[model samples]
Target: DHYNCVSSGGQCLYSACPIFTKIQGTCYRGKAKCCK
Candidate 1:
């Protein structure tokens, strides 16, 4: 399975999907409602 940085509206933030770790790191770096 794959994971995408999707919003509550089902909008993809990143052009390409990232791994759970990557997304987690990104969120820690800043702040966003990043979803998998």
Candidate 2:
């Protein structure tokens, strides 16, 4: 689930993660991953 991302200090966006943070991985079917 999306909470899994948060648990790892990450967030799932729409297409891609923000250029500011790190791109850890992707999520679900249409979610991108960004880490803090």
Candidate 3:
């Protein structure tokens, strides 16, 4: 489990790998994915 900032309501973020750094963008279903 991971504790990253996904929202401002103190929601817990989960991931398979640890995020060493913060990426400024949107995400889908708590997964690191890009959308067009």
Candidate 4:
């Protein structure tokens, strides 16, 4: 479940989340932002 961000309603991003989105968690060894 550690790498299941996409299946968890969020997508991995290398930068900041887009407008209206929020950071729920992280991925890629904390190198990414999980935007929801």
Computed on alpha carbons, the lDDT of every model, listed in order, comes to 0.34, 0.66, 0.35, 0.85
Among all candidates shown, the one with the greatest TM-score: 4
In the range 1-36, model 3's lDDT, one tens digit per residue, is 122334432323233333553434335454652221
Better of 1 and 3 by TM-score: 3
What tens-digit string does per-residue lDDT give for candidate 4 at 1-36? 237888888989988999999889888888898998
Query: For model 2, how does the per-residue alpha-carbon lDDT over 1-36 read when each residue is reduced to its tens digit?
Result: 466777888887765556777767566653555454
Least accurate 10 contiguous residues by lDDT in model 4: 1-10
Worst 10 residues of 3 by lDDT: 1-10
Better of 3 and 4 by lDDT: 4
* Candidate 1 global TM-score: 0.18
Model 4 residue pairs with clashes? none
Model 3 clash pairs are none
TM-score of each: 0.18, 0.47, 0.19, 0.78
* lDDT of model number 2: 0.66
Per-candidate clash tally? 0, 0, 0, 0
| Model 2 pairs whose backbones collide | none
